[PDB]
């Protein structure tokens with residue numbers, strides 16, 4: 001039904017929100033510290049000097065284990 | 070249809086996976102450091118001296134800003 005289509009769209013958007021903002025291919029699993037933006041996969045986060053969201057200096061990257069992984 | 074019920078269940082399970090494992094009421098937004106388990110809201114994470122997943126000591130809690138975060 002049309003309701004089935006609406007739910008498919010919501011599921012797709014939620015799943016897309018869990019993907020890396022740089023490569024759009026791998027799941028987010030890394031946090032820029034200390035700002036806390038958690039928007040990249042490990043490969044993309046490794047090479048950034050500043051947060052791509054707020055421009056804060058990245059002191060280090062913390063790996064995150066999320067239940068959604 | 071039956072597929073509407075199947076999709077409702079998938080959406081419910083994905084949303085439940087983003088809720089705190091202790092209170093079951095608030096969204097996850099905190100990481101236990103250094104183990105990295107990210108399974109609690111800020112209120113439950115503040116009260117735990119050991120990670121509830123792996124029992125490693127919590128040195129500190131890092132707040133996480135996730136694109137999935139909602140109000």
Ligand SMILES: CNC[C@@H]1COc2ccccc2O1
Pocket residue numbers: 095096097098110111112
């Ligand atoms: C994921 N938890 C965020 C919110 C923020 O404001 C809060 C205020 C009072 C109780 C809980 C609260 O939790």
Ligand SMILES: [Zn+2]
Pocket residue numbers: 020021022023024025026040041042043044045
């Ligand atoms: Zn990436």
Ligand SMILES: [Zn+2]
Pocket residue numbers: 032035036037051052053054055056
């Ligand atoms: Zn940032």
Ligand SMILES: [Zn+2]
Pocket residue numbers: 089090091092093094095109110111112113114
């Ligand atoms: Zn909680």
Ligand SMILES: [Zn+2]
Pocket residue numbers: 101104105106120121122123124125
């Ligand atoms: Zn842990």
